[PDB]
Amino acid sequence: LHRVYREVKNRLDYHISVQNMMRQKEQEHMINWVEKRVVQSISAQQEKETIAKCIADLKLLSKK
Amino acid sequence: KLALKTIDWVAFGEIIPRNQKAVANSLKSWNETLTSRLATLPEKPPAIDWAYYKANVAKAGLVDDFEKKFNALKVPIPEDKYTAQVDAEEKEDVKSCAEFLTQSKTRIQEYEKELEKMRN
Numbered sequence: 001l002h003r004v005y006r007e008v009k010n011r012l013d014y015h016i017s018v019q020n021m022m023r024q025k026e027q028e029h030m031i032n033w034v035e036k037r038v039v040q041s042i043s044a045q046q047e048k049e050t051i052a053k054c055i056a057d058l059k060l061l062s063k064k
Numbered sequence: 065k066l067a068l069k070t071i072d073w074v075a076f077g078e079i080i081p082r083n084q085k086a087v088a089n090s091l092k093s094w095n096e097t098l099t100s101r102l103a104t105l106p107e108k109p110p111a112i113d114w115a116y117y118k119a120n121v122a123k124a125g126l127v128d129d130f131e132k133k134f135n136a137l138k139v140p141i142p143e144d145k146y147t148a149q150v151d152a153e154e155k156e157d158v159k160s161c162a163e164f165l166t167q168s169k170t171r172i173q174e175y176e177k178e179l180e181k182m183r184n
Contacts (some may be wrong), residue, residue, distance in 0.1 A: 001139060005109035008134055012117050012127075019122060 042048045073092075080088040112134070118127040 002109045
């Protein structure tokens with residue numbers, strides 16, 4: 001009896017563990033994909049060098 | 065629920081020839097082992113939260129397929145092909161029982177007859 005249980009449940013849990021692994025992976029490449037599209041946003045877009053001097057000069061100020 | 069012929073152990077100690085104490089020992093421990101075992105091994109296993117799995121799946125009626133298949137799958141109970149003891153018992157009654165008891169009685173008789181005389 002215990003063996004039947006363990007084995008079935010084991011087959012079931014496999015699907016979850018798998019499903020879980022897929023999600024994780026994908027959402028790795030997904031949030032990581034963010035990186036390479038934002039390193040493309042600043043390196044490119046010369047209009048993302050203006051939004052540079054911007055937010056940053058708002059540093060000196062506040063602190064003081 | 066099991067039947068289990070009750071057993072007083074000090075008697076069991078007192079019926080084994082020495083050249084057989086080995087056996088008897090192992091027989092005792094197995095019993096104890098076995099007993100401990102059943103104290104911990106539950107009748108049936110935990111159920112299986114089928115709803116939950118059904119709730120987190122991906123292949124369609126796998127769970128339905130399984131819950132069905134699980135239930136109304138009847139696990140075989142092991143054949144008791146092992147009670148040759150009944151036999152080895154009945155044998156040692158040919159032996160111990162009748163033969164000894166018959167001679168012991170006859171000896172007790174003569175002893176008694178021998179006390180008879182001596183009363184006169």
